[PDB]
């Protein structure tokens, strides 16, 4: 997960123990510190080195996969009354580019 705020990016990498908050200034990071999920307040006693945010799914959301998700999405359209867990909704959201379960 990750949250966007003015000059501050919160991110929880899948391999990191504590979620990390990074303060940007201009076009480079100004500060970095790990925080706690509970109080959302920073933990200063955990030193934060370089963090590597690896992907969270075993795929990349490129333009090609949206293209093929639109070709496959053309069949089984079901534009109206989209069921939650069916494949018209899934492929429709893949053509829209957002990650969905069972992808």
Cα(103)–Cα(87) distance, rounded to whole angstroms?
10
Cα(3)–Cα(31) distance, rounded to whole angstroms?
16
Q: Tell me the three-class secondary structure of 10-33, residue by residue.
A: EECCCCCCCCEEEEEECCEEEEEE
* 83 makes contact with other proteins (CB under 8 A): yes
Beta bridge partners of 42: 35
Rounded least distance, CB 24 to other proteins, Å: 25
Piece of 3-11, 49-57, 59-67, 78-86 that binds other proteins (CB under 8 A): 78-86
Between residues 39 and 75, which has the closer beta carbon with respect to other proteins? 39
x/- map, 11-50, other proteins, by CB under 8 A: ---------------------------x------------
Rounded least distance, CB 85 to other proteins, Å: 4
* 6 makes contact with other proteins (CB under 8 A): no
Cα(78)–Cα(88) distance, rounded to whole angstroms?
6
* 56 makes contact with other proteins (CB under 8 A): no
């Amino acid at each position: 997960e990750f949250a966007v705020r003015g000059g501050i990016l919160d991110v929880f990498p899948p391999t990191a123990e504590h979620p990390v908050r990074v303060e940007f200034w201009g076009d480079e990071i100004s500060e970095m510190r790990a925080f706690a999920i509970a109080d959302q307040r920073s933990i200063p006693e955990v030193p934060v080195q370089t963090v590597v945010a690896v992907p969270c799914r075993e795929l990349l959301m490129t333009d090609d996969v949206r293209e093929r998700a639109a070709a496959l999405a053309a069949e089984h359209p079901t534009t109206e009354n989209t069921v939650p867990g069916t494949v018209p909704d899934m492929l429709a959201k893949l053509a829209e580019g957002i990650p969905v379960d069972g992808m």
